[PDB]
Design a protein around this ligand. Sequence first.
Ligand SMILES: O=c1[nH]c(-c2ccccc2F)cs1
Length: 125
Amino acid sequence: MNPPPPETSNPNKPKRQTNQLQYLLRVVLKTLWKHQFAWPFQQPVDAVKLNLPDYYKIIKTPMDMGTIKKRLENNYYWNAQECIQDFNTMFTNCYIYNKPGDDIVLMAEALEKLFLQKINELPTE
Ligand SMILES: O=c1[nH]c(-c2ccccc2F)cs1
């Protein structure tokens, strides 16, 4: 069974646009999205479709790149660090729900490396 997906808007949360957040969407997210290992992470985990009935018994703060993309598009974040935290949550969730060496973990490991390469240097404000 699936919980509601994470919010992509929140009217009482303040919005912001920064050069770094623009970069996270245009360069970081959009490039990672095209990687051959991106597909499992392009939408929230569907526990019914993927037959993972224990997924949300284990993962209590789900995150995916579809959600991140919508958050960036809606200027949901206050700063780049907040967005980076969502990417890190996504990767960590994968390591938590699975085990070292699993195919899905190998995919997350590769994406995390590419992610770190890309956020090593961000534009200046
Ligand atoms: O920890 C995660 N597993 C998956 C997944 C698992 C089985 C089949 C397809 C998937 F996207 C996405 S994230």
